[PDB]
Each structure stands twice: as C-alpha cells, then as structure tokens.
Write a protein that binds this ligand. Structure first.
Ligand SMILES: O=C(O)c1ccc2[nH]c(=O)[nH]c(=O)c2c1
Ligand SMILES: O=C(O)c1ccc2[nH]c(=O)[nH]c(=O)c2c1
Ligand SMILES: O=C(O)c1ccc2[nH]c(=O)[nH]c(=O)c2c1
Ligand SMILES: O=C(O)c1ccc2[nH]c(=O)[nH]c(=O)c2c1
Ligand SMILES: O=C(O)c1ccc2[nH]c(=O)[nH]c(=O)c2c1
Lengths: 280, 279, 273, 278, 273
C-alpha cells in the first residue's frame, strides 16, 4: 500500500526459481508492478526466464542494466557466482542502492569487502527466504550490513512481509535458518509425496490423498502458529488412548522420524557453512 | 454469507473434536454459539470449561442434547457409541440427522441399533480433524441408507465452513483416518523435531518453532494451489550441490518416506481393528 | 573424416561399432591401436573392418579426430609418446574419466601451441546407438570442433555440451549408470525366478520394463513421480512393492552410488595432478 | 493385418491402463481412435478427458461398450470384476473375446460367471504395463478354455503392436505382475533418485533426469540385444579401481539387489491376495 | 548297465557328462528324454553321444537304472505316464528335491508291487566329477541296489547313504551350496576389481582360493576354525578382513541360507502331499 506508492524499481541478478518466486509473490501482493522488476541471467533459455517474461518482468542479458534500473537489487545466484558478480558490477553500485544478497552462506563481510573497493559505504542486507513467497506464505529472515540505514531494514521488512513471515536476525543465525525454513519446504514436499503414497496403499485415489495430506499439514501448521501451546501438547490432544493416531505415532518413533528431521536441518546448515568456506 | 437460520446443532461428547467443531462453526459465523448444545459425563473437562466461555449450552444429560438438536454430532470414543445409541435411541425423531465422528464405526452398525427404535434413521458418517478449530480442517463424509440428498448437501455446506469437505464412499474412511485424521499429529511431531534441529544449529527455540511451522504451512499451501507434482515442487527448492539436496539425502538414507507410509498404514489398520472388535 | 582410437578396450569397440552401425563412418576409415593385441575387444574390431596396429604413432598419422580410449592413469604416457606427432588438423578427444582439459593441454602444449582438445564422457550403450554423451571444448577448440563432435556423437545416442566442471558428476550418473541398471536387471530377474518365472523370461520382461519406462520418461513432459503415480492403482500390487523399496532406502542407495562414482572420479584426477 | 481389418475394441474402465492401450493402439495404426469405445462410472476423471481428446467414444453405460465391441478389455480393479460380469454378462455373445487385465483375477472365475449366461465364453487373461503408450510395453497373456486358435493369434498381433508380447501359462501371470507389471514404477522411482544424486553432485535437474533416463534406456537395450549375462555386461563396464566399481560397492552395501527381489515378491504376493479375497 | 534320464535339463547333462568322463558309462549306453527338445541342455547331450528321444516310454524300455531328473511338481505325472512300464529289473532313482520315497512307491505300487526306488540329492559339480551326493534306499530296494548306486555316484564325487529324513537338510547345504559359492566368487572378484585387479585375474584367484581351502579342509583332520587360526597372522591383513566379515554377520547369513533352502524343500513336498 505505502510501498506500492513508493514506486520502487526492483532488480534481480539471477533469474532462477527464487527470483521467479519472489517476483511472482511481490506482484501478487500488489507491492510492485511486474514491469518495474528487471531480471538478468547468463542463460536466457531457462524456463524460469520464460515465466518471468510472461508476467511482464523486464529481462536482459546485461547485469549492468539490471543494476542501473534497480533501487533495491537482489542477488539471487549461487554462492560461488557472487564474487564474480560483485567484481563485474561493483563499479555500477550507487549510493542510492540497497544490495540484498539471497545467496546461502555468503557473509555480509565478504560482500562489503568487494563493494567497498568501489564506493565506500555500500548498503548491504543479507536475506534467507524460501519458495512459498510465491503464495505469499514465505518465511524470511534478514540481517543488516554495516552501512544499511535504519530505514533500509524497515523497508526490507515491509517488502518481505508482503509475501510471508519476515523478521530481523543477527547474521550468525542465518546458516541455521537456511537448514530449517530455507530447505524446509522440500522436507514438506517429500513428506506430502510419502503420505499420499500411504493413502494410495490403503485404497485412496491419488488425487484425494494428495489433497488430504496437504490440507492436514496446512491445518496443523496454522494450529501451531495460532496456538501458544507446545507442539507436543497439540500432539497429545490429537491422540485418543489406544487409538489410531497413537499407533501411527509409535511406528514413526520406531524409525527415528524425529532424528531424521534433526539430521536434515543439520546437514543443510553444515553444507551452507562449507559453501562459504569454499568461497572463503 | 452463509448462515443456518433454522438449524440447531448438538454434541454428544464434549472432548477435543466437539470443542474444535463448535469453535470453528462459531468463528465461521454460520452458527450462533447459543444454538449449539453439548453433553458430557465429566463436566470438569478442560474442553467443557472452554465451551462455556463461547456461549455453548452445556448439560450432563444426552437426552437434553437430542431434544434440543436437529443435527446431532456423536463425538464420543468408539466403544461408547453402542451405549450412547442404547440411551437416546428412543428419543431420535424424524427431523434428526445423526452425524457420527467415531473412528471406524460403520454406518451399518449405527443404523442397526437406531432402527430397533424407529425405522429410517438419517445417519452420516464423518471423519474430520482438529484443525477445524482454525477453519482449516480436512473432512470427509459418507451418507447412510436413509439420508436424503439434502442431508448430505447440508452437512457438506456446514463442514465446508471449517475447512475442506467432500463426500466419499464409506469404505475409504478408515484410510482417510490414517492420512488426514492422524496427519496433524504427524505434523506436530515433525515440527517439534525440526525445531530441535534449529536449536541444535543455534536458533532460539521460539524462532525455530515459528520458522518451521511457517515453512510447512507455506509448502502445503503451495501444493494446494499448484497443479504440479510435489516432486516437481521439491526439485525447484534444491539448487545443484546446495544445502537442501544435501539434507534431502539424509532424509532418504533414513527411509523418511517409508516411515510416513508406515504411519498411514498403521492408523488405518488400527481403525479397522477398532471396528472389527466392535462387531 | 578419418577417426583413430588410442586404446582398444571396451569403450573403443562400443564407439566404433556404434559409429559404423549409424552409417556416419566407414569401418575402413577407422584405425585403432592397442598395446595388448590379444584382447577380445581387439579381435572384435578386426571382424568389424577396423584397421588395427600396435603403434600409437600410426593411428595419429592416419586420423583427423583422435579418441583417447585409455585408462586415466595412462593418458600422460600417451601424450608423451604422441605429443610430437599432433598437428594443426588434429582434434584430440579424451574419453578418460577425470582427466582435465588443462592437464591434456599442458602436456601437448610443450610440443606445439594451441592443441585442439575435447573432453568427452560417454558410456557403453553407444554400441546399440543409445549412449549418453556430454563433452566440453578446450581452450583452442574452434567452434566447428564442438559442432562436429556433437554431430558425430549424436549419431550413437544423446549428446550435449557441458561446462567441464559438470563432467565428474555426469560420470557418476550416466557413465556408471548402465552398471547400476545391469545390477538392477539381474536382481529383478532373481525376483521373477523366486516367484516362479523361468530365468530367460524374467530377464526379457525386466529389461523390457526398464526400457519402456525410460522411453516413457524421455518422451513425456511429466515428472517421474507423476508417472509413478499413474502406474500405482490404489491398494494394488505396485504400491505394495513401492513401499518395500522405500523401507529399504532404495532411493538413497542410488544417490549414494552417483555420489561415490563422482567422488572417486575426483580422487583419480587429484592423484594424477 | 486382416486380423485388425474390421475389428472394434472396447474398454470397460477408463483409467490409466485403458488410456495407455488406446494411445498405443492408435499410435501403432492398428486401430482407429473412433473404432474404440470406453465406459466409466465417473466421466469426470483426468483420463476420460484425454480419451475424449483422442476421439475415442465415451459412455457411462457398460452395456453400450459391449454391444459395440468385438474385443472387450476389462480394465477395472479386481474387486469390481464380479460386479461388471453380473452387469454385462447377459450381453456377452459368441462373437465376443473378453480380455481381462485385472490383476490376479483368474480365467476360471470369469468363465464361471459368464458361463451362467452362455456356455462357451471366449476369455483371455492379460498382464501389460503403461509403456504400451510409447509402444514399448511388456505383455503376457493366457488363453481360456473356449478361446479359439485364432483368438490367441489375434491377441498376440494386437499386443505386439505396442511392445513385447508372449503367451504364458496362467500360473505365471501373478509373477509377471510383480516384475513387468509393476516394473515401470520401480524404474520411475530409480530415475527420480538417480536425478537427485546428479543434482547433489552439481548437475541441473533437467540434465540429470535426461542423462539418467538415457542411461537406463541404453543399458536395457544393450541387455536385450546381447546374449551375455547382465553380470558379464556389468564386468565389462567396471574398470579396476574405477568410479563404477566404487559405486557398485555402495549399492551392494545397502542390499540394493535384495530390495528389488523384495519388490517383485511383494507385488506378486499382493496380486495373489487381491484374488484370494475377491 | 544301461542308464536313462527322464528330464534333460541342467542336472541330467551334468550327471551324463560326469559319468562318461569318469569312464563308468559309455555315452551310447545312455538315453535321455525331454518334452522341450529345444533346450540347450538337450543339444549338449546330443554332441556328447547320448541317445535322445521325446517319448518317456522309450527311455524306460531301454534302461535298467532310471534317473528322474524332472522338477518336483512333474514327478506324479511322470509316474502316471510310465508306471505301467516299470519292470522287475528297473531301479528308479529320483533326484527331484523334496519328493519322498513314500510318494513314489505309492504311485508306482498301483501298477506293480515292490518297485525298487532310490532317492538321491546331488548337485551340479558332478559335471567336473566333484559332486556331493547322498542317497536313501526305498522299501524294496535290494542290498545290491544301494551298493551299485554308491559305486556309480562315487565316480562323480563324494557319495554316501543317509536316512531319508536328512535329505531336505542336505538339499539346503550341498544341493544349494554351489550357488552360494558362485555368489561368493562373484563378490570376491568385485572386491579384487575394486582394489585394482583385472576381472579375469580376480576371478581366477578367488576361485583358486576357495578350491584350495576346501581341499585343505577335506584332507585335514582339523576343525575349520583351527585352519582359520593358522591363516591369520597377529595384527595382519587376514584377521582385519575376518573382523569385517563378523561385523556383518557373515556366518549367520550362511546359516540363514541353509535353513531357507531346507524349509522351502519341505514346503514344496508338503504342497505335493
Ligand atoms: O541451495 C539451496 O538449497 C537453497 C535453499 C533455500 C535458499 N533460500 C534463499 O533465500 N537463498 C538461497 O540461496 C537458498 C538456497
Ligand atoms: O484415535 C484417534 O487418534 C483419532 C484421530 C482422528 C479422529 N477424527 C474423527 O473425526 N473421529 C475420531 O474418532 C478420530 C480419532
Ligand atoms: O572406470 C569407470 O568406472 C568408467 C566408467 C565409464 C567411463 N566412460 C568414459 O567415457 N570414460 C571413462 O573413463 C569411463 C570410466
Ligand atoms: O495393481 C497394480 O498395481 C497393477 C499394476 C500393473 C497392472 N497391469 C495390467 O495389465 N493390469 C493390472 O491390473 C495391473 C495392476
Ligand atoms: O531347485 C533347486 O534349488 C534344486 C537344487 C539342487 C537340486 N539337486 C538334486 O539332486 N535335485 C533337485 O531337485 C535340486 C533342486
């Protein structure tokens, strides 16, 4: 509302799944006109690029053009690409820019070190988000850089709140957030596929089983978000004595279900830390 | 702009699912709380204490609920159902729609007990879940022998106000129980574990719970709004060599998918057992 | 166009058989050299019509496109043997797993500047013209070099250009993939035999099943999970079998395999460098 | 080809298998799409939409499919078969060849139900799979008590147009179900996982899927065109100390082979159960 | 002495090849009958010099010792086909797994009293004269019948008489044993290849290792655990490898195998009876 009237220009360096998801989310939110977004990519024959083209997002092979168009500039490329990108358009970053890095593991310090060689006070924000911004139910955290104004963090929270949950964190939490909510949707998609397989095994049509499993997970997550109760307490409320649910919970426990999800968060976090160590 | 002006709803049993439906129904604005009555043997229940605050009428006597109500939800444990039907069978009238939410309990068994008192009882079997309390439930129903077409349409309209609702053949309901009946508990277990993972890697517990729940909510919503297979949506998250595909490997190495299949199967089989013992 | 092979083991035979079955090369325009002129793969190229020789230098002098079909540990010795013989006309195509374009160009540049080098990763089903091939172009490979290589290798299966840093991963997937499939086919046949089928029939049916599913996926726009959903009737035989695969961590074993083959390929080159 | 000259085909059931066979048949040029009729209890399915696109005639009444068909494919679940035989049984004539594709359902059970209407029903039992849609199916069939010599011949020619087809004794069919009936789902599972492995090691998903499918297709063709044992072909692929033999070890360490045996066995046993129940 | 085979699959070929290699029977004094006169095992007996025929009755009329080398589910049909043709002179030797002497004698006694029946459990290495055979004598088998059978089958490997109730267990051990060994040899060769040996050499060395160890044990009075102790030098390579076998439950897998083959053999006969 107030952000739409700001008439912001947004740029994405990188035109893959995350850039498409955010562009789709921002336009569905009405905070940005699609034609006020510009995206660049070295490979213009990607499917995500054609989807962005149909939305009306401006597309170019030239990262400099994205930079010059943009007020808020998202870096949506892989971690090992970031230093080459900063070398290439570092001279084109202006005082008016806010540079938002979405690269997993890449530290504000490494970005500011590159950019400060060109102009002395680059405004940098580090972001970690996920694909459900496309349905305006993302989970986003951000940390502000050395030179990011207080108004810069409030602007970014306003923008990212339009497509889901958003909150400021200290940067040292972001690798862990990556393993939880960055990778989280993929754990859920895996779980939903498996639950549907279970529904089909027990005689449900696939379409119904997918719908029911997804509705179950959505409702449960919303319950927890609207409850101040522990998830174990909500689990207890579901499970009647001797009943169907408690029998199913036992077979999950017998396979170490809980430990697998802990293993997943840890593995994603650890990999995020070693992608940056390979950079560093 | 739905509102059932001439419908009175009663709950026999005042436990978790009764409160959840009454809360969902009232939050939806389709029923005034004062047109809902609930009966319970343990009037010191925490759920029976909350229903009073909403304005739901409470009574200790199942006969009062039956006499007050047109739509009668049977929200009791499965083994109590034949004792309930023995109690109020002679009080069932033509106007009544009896909606059983008892897991596993067949329409045939309910109709056989009620038909000893008055022929043609109108019976609908329901399987729903606790997220109706936030109007995001997953409900299926099957109509009995003597249920009229308007009965099912009315129940679907009512249960659609608190989440997804669709008609199914009765022999699918034990499997629905294993999937969406028990599913929220699988999700609560997963969210506790994901939060433990976040805490292990250094996040505060409160933030970890919030992020994990938001992640699951968003992913579920994506799937419901997409025509794409969940495997395609999974593919879009995982960048080559990246954090997510490394985490997906450790889920696979533990047989994560098989445990969720095991769970649906175990809940379904137990539902079939509970009934085969009722017979 | 004349083609030569340094090395005459399994992969050299598979390419030459595929190329000539494709009609893109005449067998008499192909030359192959081997140290052990007693390998069974050597006698097969003989019956095929390929010109044979023990001298690596003869192959170089007779061919324009030069395939290096030797084990990765022998490439430096081959380059040191023939490096003085490479000319402006030669396109050197290394099929050795792990071996970098950099390492080939370094050895050859000591003899003549700007060697034209291509790195290729292919697999044995080129012998039935259904291989899977990727290639990366070297520093001095001209534009027509890559296009020529794609034209040649597309005649024996799928072929596409990649950045060289993907090739070790390709090795773990389609380079080693046929071996995973042969293992799977042996095991599926054992399962058919356990359940009462004659071995010959069980082999034929399992192989046909795998061929048809692979073709379905290549010819469909749909995700393999969606095609899986279409096979599995509710409550049926297939979804019961898929559960027992999942319970054993079937998917993770295949991920483990691609990872292990890729990592070993990286080790083999690190030991070379 | 004079077998298929004036032949009309009907599918009772409009699910995934009826669609796959109708697509395969029309793609093969054996039958014309308009000469094919299908019936379903729910004309609002996903597959019934595609069949309408192809030009196949659709109806909600199975009696209409029977009266319009020479070769009648029963493409429904095994528990529905006795209900369908009760429904259309009085309409089966001496001209009809009844082809059951239901898993586990025995020729004897079908003949018993149809013999109450007319005494010599011509029955064939079939087990095929979804890759008939690209004419690379794997099909077996067994002929019933009253199937004429030309009947199995016609069936052989029809199903060979869409892939491999051979006659078997009926007592092998449950085992074939576990192997080539369910087989494609094992392959799709394996291809999804192999692509995940490629992605973990840095490949784009689209490329990883293409390479994995091509690897599987090429290996399968190699074995079909070779007289050699699959273990021999495996040995030819594995260079000493190399990448492939290292990957084969980790497959062996997880019992990869036993999982595929388990799968064939579980599918076969479920097929026997579905019949022993119904 | 004239010998016949009803059945001409793997086991019939192995016995006939072993017998004639042993010099105890002339190939022209051997007759074999099969329904599928197109099996590869049938053409091998042809090249060997064995007289072939499709008619089970011809084999019976031409031979004195009559081997039943058919699958266990076909024995009753064979007995019903030829039972009227058995005479005083015939010794009927059933090699079908699980099939009891009782069931054979019951079917044959309906035609002529006192049929002379032997039950045998052998294995494929009779083809190289290193088989393992046990036999049990029937109710009406004379004393010279057992001694003759031991003389014949000792020419193609180890042979001893047993009580019939041990034969299902023997089936699980030496009947199925060669298959366990072939599996073990394939896996040991894979291990040699992983560690850098060429496949042909790894197969030869692994097979020689197994042959020599088996011969050591047969020729020694010592317990296999004691011979194991003699191989394993303290701190050495062998004792490290034995630990990893133990950690995987190697011994229990072999016990599982003998048990599973024995139990299945009992099931197959229970289904027959
Ligand atoms: O590589 C991955 O698995 C992955 C997952 C989520 C992510 N979310 C985000 O905001 N930036 C990222 O790079 C990102 C990467
Ligand atoms: O025992 C349980 O865990 C359980 C779970 C979900 C349920 N949903 C419903 O509608 N009625 C029920 O009894 C029910 C019971
Ligand atoms: O040793 C191996 O496991 C192996 C497998 C496939 C290969 N394909 C190719 O093109 N060059 C290679 O060296 C190669 C090696
Ligand atoms: O139950 C199943 O999963 C299944 C799988 C493959 C099949 N192929 C066929 O031809 N008829 C079938 O019923 C069939 C059923
Ligand atoms: O089917 C089997 O696994 C098997 C193995 C060994 C055998 N040895 C013998 O003498 N008669 C048999 O039937 C036999 C059967």
């Amino acid at each position: 509302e107030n952000l739409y009237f700001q008439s912001m220009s947004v740029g994405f360096i990188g035109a893959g799944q995350l850039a498409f998801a955010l562009a789709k989310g921002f336009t569905a939110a009405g905070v940005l006109a699609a034609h006020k977004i510009m995206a660049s990519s070295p490979d213009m024959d990607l499917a995500t690029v054609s989807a962005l083209r149909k939305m009306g997002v401006k597309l170019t092979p030239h990262n400099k053009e994205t930079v010059q168009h943009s007020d808020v500039l998202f870096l949506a490329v892989k971690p090992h690409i970031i230093p080459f990108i900063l070398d290439e358009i570092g001279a084109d970053i202006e005082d008016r820019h806010i540079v938002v890095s979405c690269a997993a593991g890449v530290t504000i310090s490494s970005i500011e070190k590159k950019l400060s060689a060109f102009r002395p006070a680059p405004r940098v924000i580090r972001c970690m988000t996920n694909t459900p911004v496309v349905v305006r139910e993302g989970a986003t955290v951000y940390a502000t850089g050395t030179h990011a104004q207080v108004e810069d963090g409030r602007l970014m929270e306003q923008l990212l709140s339009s497509v889901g949950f958003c909150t400021e964190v200290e940067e040292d939490l972001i690798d862990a957030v990556t393993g939880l909510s960055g990778s989280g949707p993929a754990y859920a998609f895996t779980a939903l596929d498996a639950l549907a397989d279970g529904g089909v095994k027990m005689g449900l049509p696939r379409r119904l089983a997918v719908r029911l499993g997804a509705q179950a997970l959505l409702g449960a997550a919303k319950m927890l978000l609207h409850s101040e109760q522990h998830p174990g307490q909500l689990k207890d409320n579901v499970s009647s004595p001797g009943g169907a649910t408690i029998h199913a919970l036992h077979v999950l426990e017998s396979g170490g279900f809980r430990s697998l999800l802990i293993n997943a968060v840890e593995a994603s976090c650890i990999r995020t830390r070693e992608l940056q160590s390979m950079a560093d």
